[PDB]
Structure 1
Amino acid sequence: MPHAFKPGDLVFAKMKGYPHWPARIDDIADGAVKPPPNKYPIFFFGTHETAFLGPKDLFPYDKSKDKYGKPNKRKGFNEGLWEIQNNPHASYS
């Protein structure tokens, strides 16, 4: 059975106006800004941007990739497909 989201989990994450985007649940570093309650820090592959999202916008990657893991014309997307499949736990700082 599913657990709650934890850092390291791979997802597609949905933001208004954008396709379901390859992403991971990030850790929060010591001393860094925390997310709002009930939100997770989401690191978007390809763009390398972070936003705070709740579970309603988080689709586990294994279950969802057949539907959402297709090339897109949006900036950063196809790089991000490569990252989530090939090195999803790397440092992209």
Structure 2
Amino acid sequence: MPHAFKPGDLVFAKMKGYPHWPARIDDIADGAVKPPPNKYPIFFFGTHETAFLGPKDLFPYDKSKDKYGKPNKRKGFNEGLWEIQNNPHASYS
């Protein structure tokens, strides 16, 4: 049975006007800006951008990859696919 999301979990993350995007739940570093309540810091692979999202927009990677894990034309998407599959826990700073 599922637990709540935790730092290191891999997902496709959905934001308005974008295809479901490979991403991970990030840690918050000491001294770093915390997300609003009920929100998680989401690091998007490929673009290397962060946004704050709630669970409604977070699709666990293993379950969803056969649907969402396909090449897309959008900038940084295919880079993103490589990273989630090949080094999802690396530093991309």
Q: Aligning the two structures, in what range does the TM-score lie when normalised by the shorter sequence? A: over 0.9
Q: Which consecutive unaligned segments of at least 5 residues does structure 2 have? A: none
- Per-residue CA deviations over 1:25-78 (Å, capped at 9, x if unaligned) read 000000000000000000000000000000000000000000000000000000
The percent identity for this pair of structures is 100
Q: Distance in 2 between matches of 1:22 and 1:81?
A: 6
Q: Which residue of 2 aligns with 1:11?
A: 11
Q: Which residue of 1 aligns with 2:34?
A: 34
Q: Distance in 1 between matches of 2:87 and 2:37?
A: 29
The number of residue pairs the alignment matches comes to 93
Q: Which consecutive unaligned segments of at least 5 residues does structure 1 have? A: none
Q: Distance in 2 between matches of 1:51 and 1:76?
A: 16
The Cα shift of 1:81 comes to 0.1
Q: Distance in 2 between matches of 1:56 and 1:66?
A: 19
Task: Write out the 4+ residue segments of structure 1 that deviate beyond 4 Å after TM superposition.
Answer: none
Q: Which residue of 1 aligns with 2:71?
A: 71
